Amino acid sequence: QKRSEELSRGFYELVYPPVDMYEEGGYLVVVADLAGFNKEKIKARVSGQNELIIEAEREITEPGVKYLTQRPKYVRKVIRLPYNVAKDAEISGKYENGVLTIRIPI
Amino acid sequence: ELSRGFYELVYPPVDMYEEGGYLVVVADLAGFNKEKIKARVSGQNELIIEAEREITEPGVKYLTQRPKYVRKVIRLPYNVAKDAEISGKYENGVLTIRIPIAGTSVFKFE
User: Residue B26: which CATH number?
Assistant: 2.60.40.790
Q: Which residues contact A68 (CB under 8 A, 6 or more apart)?
A: A6, B14, B15, B16, B17, B74
What is the span of the domain harbouring residue B14? 1-110
For chain B, say whether A6 makes contact (Cβ under 8 Å): no
d(Cα A65, Cα B36) in Å, to the nearest integer?
A: 30
DSSP readout, A27-77?
EEEEEEE--S--GGGEEEEEETTTEEEEEEE------SEEEE--S-SEEEE
User: Of A96, A74, A22, A60, which Cα lies nearest the Cα of B30?
Assistant: A96
The data reach a resolution, in angstroms, of 1.9
B interface test, pick of A97, A103, A106 with most B CB neighbours within 10 Å? A97
CB pair distance less than 8 Å for B17 and A79:
no
d(CA B8, CA A18): 10
The single-letter code of the amino acid at B39 is A
What are the backbone dihedrals phi and psi of residue A10, each rounded to the nearest 5 degrees, phi first? -60, -40
* Interchain CB contact of A51 with B (< 8 Å): no
* Residue of B19, B62, B93 with shortest CB distance to A22: B62
Count structural domains, chain B. 1
- Within 56-85 of A, beta carbons closer than 8 Å to B belong to 60, 62-72, 79, 82
Note the Cα B107 to chain centre separation in Å.
Answer: 24
Q: What experimental approach yielded this model? A: X-ray
